[PDB]
Amino acid sequence: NNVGPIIRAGDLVEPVIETAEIDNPGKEITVEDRRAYVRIAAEGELILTRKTLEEQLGRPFNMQELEINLASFAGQIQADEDQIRFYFDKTM
Numbered sequence: 001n002n003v004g005p006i007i008r009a010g011d012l013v014e015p016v017i018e019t020a021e022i023d024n025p026g027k028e029i030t031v032e033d034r035r036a037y038v039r040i041a042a043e044g045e046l047i048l049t050r051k052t053l054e055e056q057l058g059r060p061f062n063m064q065e066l067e068i069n070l071a072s073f074a075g076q077i078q079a080d081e082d083q084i085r086f087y088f089d090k091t092m
Contacts, residue, residue, distance in 0.1 A: 001088040002030065003075025004041040005048070005066070012069055013038050015056035016048065022056075023047045037071050046075075049083040 004020065007013050020029050020040050024047055032039040040046070054061040063081060075086040 001044055002041040003044065003086040003088050004039070004046040004073065005070050005084075005086065006072045006074070007038045007040065007069065008036050008071040009069040010036065012066065015053060016040060016066070018056050019048050019052045020046055023049050023052050039074075041074060044088050046086040047083055048086075050081065 005016060007016055017029070017031055017040055020042065024042055024045070027042045027046075029046075030039075030041045032041075048066065050061060050063050053063075053066065063079065063084060066084065067079070073086060076089045076092065078085045078087070
């Protein structure tokens with residue numbers, strides 16, 4: 001039931017990996033590194049907050065920048081101006 005983003009933009013990969021680690025403490029994070037198609041996943045749920053991403057990037061950041069640079073993703077999303085949550089929904 002692994003879920004999470006697949007990142008197309010090379011310059012967001014490390015910031016998103018680190019955000020995944022920071023905003024999902026204790027969870028196993030798996031990365032499948034392939035050029036321009038980096039899968040980042042955790043079981044059940046993976047949250048990425050705007051605050052953490054901004055801090056990893058060290059400059060102003062809006063969730064749109066992550067979203068427009070997703071190649072795809074696993075799971076369902078709930079997203080707003082503050083965060084995106086990838087999650088597994090057993091009914092779909």
